[PDB]
From a paper:
In [name] ([name]), onset of programmed cell death is marked with the activation of [name]-3, a process that requires assembly of the [name] apoptosome. [name]-3 is synthesized as an inactive zymogen; its activation requires association with the [name] apoptosome. Activated [name]-3 forms a holoenzyme with the [name] apoptosome to cleave a wide range of substrates, leading to irreversible cell death. Here, we report cryo-EM structures of the [name] apoptosome and three distinct [name]/[name]-3 complexes that mimic different activation stages for [name]-3.
Author numbering:
A (entry chain A), C (entry chain B): 112 to 416, 424 to 487, 522 to 543
B (entry chain H): 1 to 110
D (entry chain K): 1 to 105
The structure:
């Protein structure tokens, strides 16, 4: 247990979190990794919402057991991607060449940037002989170009990403683990862990509940809201749940371990990458009963664009498979749903006009001609007017 | 590789390893117990001054050995046992009896 | 006691103050450091107001007892930060790479500027082996990136800073020591130490007390006042005092051990870093009682933004946790207070119109409405009409 | 001098020789059975802590005795027989059998 730490540090693995461990996941990211010892050049996709906590779990999954490093894999290489430029997918590998290199001849490191991608690639798989059965953690992939090169480099990869629309790049053994929103029961544990008045009183239990709903189970913004519960008095938690329904994530922004002071700053990046036409879909998501199972047609009303309509659904599925902005279900009827955290980002992230503009369009097609059945009662989005009442 | 404890020892007991010691004396015993290489011994064996052979022996050594065994099991044989005794004393005031290292084995040389 | 000096000099540690030493703090910065011999990668935050003297005491401790260097830690690395640019948090470590390097191969020092971070970081923790029990002193951290990188470098850090809002980034146990304003009794000692007339004329006594009150324990300013009383004549101290209530710190500015001629030059930097909206809170904090315990509502009157006045408190707390710009108290009632030194800076720097504008609004709130009880007597601003007449 | 077996024993049974033992107790019995010297007993007899007297007793001892006899024949007499029994057990699981551990794990 002292050799790991040597290997973790040198593979640039981040300090594993300690005060609260997501058992079921870390224990699911280790299992799947053990199962892959023979199958060479495999992808493991630890994909989730933004700030949803994926990267922390890889820190823990490679830090709990003594097996993953030493027993199952000899060495670790953990590199943060976050590449957007077209030079980024090449630059990552230059940083993965020196990583793999010896402590000796970092002095001799040449003008590596001025070389062909056929040389950096050959140059890597030429020195990759030394370390066999080596896995490479690619914290935060945005570009499918990374997934491309890697498969050409026959690598063993753990991958933390938000958009799961890039695995398509790999024709291969792709296995997946989704970092969901923190379940209700779990959250409690998270709070207690960091030191905080637990739900006890009635009005307060009912007051502690509201909190989770707002963050809609989100560790990053569940942290930011605590690093701002400085007094730790319930009376001060209530002072703020308010601040939220009037300032979005912005007011709650509190500097913390997340590279990001605000979640809106994160999600930005999830709204830039979006297909130009898919981007327009995000704006209308705002005007919608937050956190409600609602039909496709009721959505067809606000969303831009035929005798047969199925284009609304296509946008809602794509948008749901790229930052996990929207949540769609199959049964009983094809319906999607927005999440508060995913909702406040837009409420403060869209043209103040386009909100009101969109509300008028929904009311127009409104007249037309948990078991919600907007089949004879869509005429009245009043069940959701509780939200629609808001500008 | 060693670590802070095992390297802090080679450093604390340094005022001493300079007054009486010689890396040429240990090269044969270490090419042997499998902790060196025939370039290693070349590099430390052809050095004009001893503080050179010593600084290279302590640099090269901290990288090669899985532990600080094959250097106590040498100052013993080399009639420099007043050395291997000091270092074994230091390694003992860490694992078994903690705390006692600073008052006992560290301060009497300030 | 001759080996220390070798180690102090090479670790670039500044010489500790001799003519006046604080046994309580220096003796509290050494204690906490000894307690961390067993612990690894820890942060010690010696945080205080600008000019309090944090940096002087760190060196003081380091050089006093010889146990810290030799007994508790093998070597010392003391580096001044003061980084504002985004390249600064990287540049600090380039200066911390060569520090850690051997006297040999400073010749071979490569084009370190053109190196990837993941390399400077790996390159540092790759040579950090040859450095058992290393204590790094980071005199003057402003950015949290240095705190960030450091935690990734599993370092042992003493830290001198003004803002204690970045020490919290680190998700590891952290020990704090606050450099308070110099207590009344202490000050006396400071003067006698450098030299000053002994209490003789009851009035002279009283006047010296008033002077120590003004400079709310800011040795930097205290030094500024001292250096500039050359006549060492009381009759000239009373000439100097006046100059203050008419020229702020500006007139008192003199060459001192401080990198800064004027304290206002220092505090500047504490007003630039400030949240844009927090900057104005401070800007409107100028028109306030100086060194007087005053209620939150009385403050709600001058500060920008239903029964949501709490926003005033949030600004006053944040502003107080950024170089100790404010001094909020909890009991009996939530009240803050300004300090003269903190008062002469803003007053002589901020807009007079804002000062007036603010002084006009206060009256509106008034009409709407040490054991001060502005609960039935806030209507009256005549209590400090002495301070109130000045503008 | 002893050897690796007899010295590996003084080392293996070390967690124990620290909890209950004292070199002052054995100095008289060893200046006697001819294995010490009046400077030896001086050196180990004037030591502030016991871990000092113990580390010097185990250092000095490993050089002086032709064997590990006059130290089993002592923990017996000193009511510390739970010690001399452990060490005699260890010397036997090597004296009566030609097989051990090899270079392994
Ligand atoms: N198990 C956990 N314990 C404590 N904090 C957590 C945990 N999981 C997530 N967080 C919060 O999220 C921040 C980092 O989130 P994390 O990096 O784990 O999410 P992520 O999915 O990587 O987001 P991204 O994909 O944007 O990197 C931490 O600073 C912390 O505030
Ligand atoms: N113990 C002391 N003895 C003498 N002068 C002092 C002492 N403490 C502070 N000073 C004054 O302050 C100046 C340096 O202050 P110091 O650097 O100690 O404060 P600081 O908190 O580091 O400020 P900053 O955070 O801006 O570095 C000295 O030149 C001296 O004028
Ligand atoms: Mg991350
Ligand atoms: Mg300074």
């Amino acid at each position: 247990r002292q050799m790991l730490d040597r290997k973790l540090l040198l593979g640039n693995v981040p300090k594993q979190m300690t005060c609260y461990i997501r058992e079921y996941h870390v224990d699911r990211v280790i299992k799947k990794l053990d199962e892959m010892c023979d199958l060479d050049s495999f992808f493991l996709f630890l994909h989730g919402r933004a700030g949803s906590g994926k990267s922390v779990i890889a820190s823990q999954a490679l830090s709990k057991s003594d097996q993953l490093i030493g027993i199952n894999y000899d060495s670790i290489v953990w590199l943060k991607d976050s590449g957007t430029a077209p030079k980024s997918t090449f630059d990552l590998f230059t940083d993965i060449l020196l990583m793999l290199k010896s402590e000796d001849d970092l002095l001799n490191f040449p003008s590596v940037e001025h070389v062909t991608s056929v040389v950096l690639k050959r140059m890597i798989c030429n020195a990759l002989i030394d370390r066999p059965n080596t896995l490479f953690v690619f914290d935060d992939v945005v570009q499918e170009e990374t997934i491309r090169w890697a498969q050409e480099l026959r690598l063993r990869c753990l991958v933390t990403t938000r958009d799961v629309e890039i695995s398509n790049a790999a024709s291969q053994t792709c296995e997946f683990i989704e970092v969901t929103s923190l379940e209700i029961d779990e959250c409690y544990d998270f709070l207690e862990a960091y030191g905080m008045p637990m739900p006890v009183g009635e009005k307060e239990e009912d007051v502690l509940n509201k909190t989770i709903e707002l963050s809609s189970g989100n560790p990053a913004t569940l942290m930011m809201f605590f690093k701002s519960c400085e007094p730790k008095t319930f009376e001060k938690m209530a002072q703020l749940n308010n601040k939220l329904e009037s300032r979005g994530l912005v007011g709650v922004e509190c500097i913390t371990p997340y590279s990001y002071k605000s979640l809106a700053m994160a999600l930005q990046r999830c709204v830039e990458v979006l297909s130009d036409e898919d981007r327009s879909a995000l704006a209308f998501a705002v005007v919608m009963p937050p956190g409600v199972d609602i039909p496709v047609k009721l959505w067809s009303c606000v969303i831009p664009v035929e005798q047969l309509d199925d284009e609304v659904a296509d946008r809602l599925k794509r948008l749901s498979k790229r930052g996990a902005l929207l949540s769609g279900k199959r049964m009983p009827v094809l319906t999607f749903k927005i999440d508060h955290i995913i909702h406040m980002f837009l409420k403060h992230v869209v043209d103040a006009q386009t909100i009101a503009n969109g509300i008028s369009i929904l009311e127009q097609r409104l007249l037309e001609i948990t078991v919600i059945r907007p089949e004879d009662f869509p005429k009245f989005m009043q069940l959701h007017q509780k939200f629609y009442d808001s500008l | 590789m060693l670590c802070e404890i095992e390297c802090r020892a080679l450093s604390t007991a340094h005022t001493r390893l300079i007054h009486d010691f010689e890396p040429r004396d240990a090269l044969t015993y270490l090419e042997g117990k499998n902790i060196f290489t025939e370039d290693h011994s070349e590099l430390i064996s052809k050095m004009s001054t001893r503080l050179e052979r010593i600084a290279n022996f302590l640099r090269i050594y901290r990288r090669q050995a899985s532990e600080l065994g094959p250097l106590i099991d040498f100052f013993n044989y080399n009639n420099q046992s007043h050395l291997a005794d000091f270092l074994e004393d230091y390694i003992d005031f860490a694992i078994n009896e903690p705390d006692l290292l600073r008052p006992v084995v560290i301060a009497p040389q300030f």
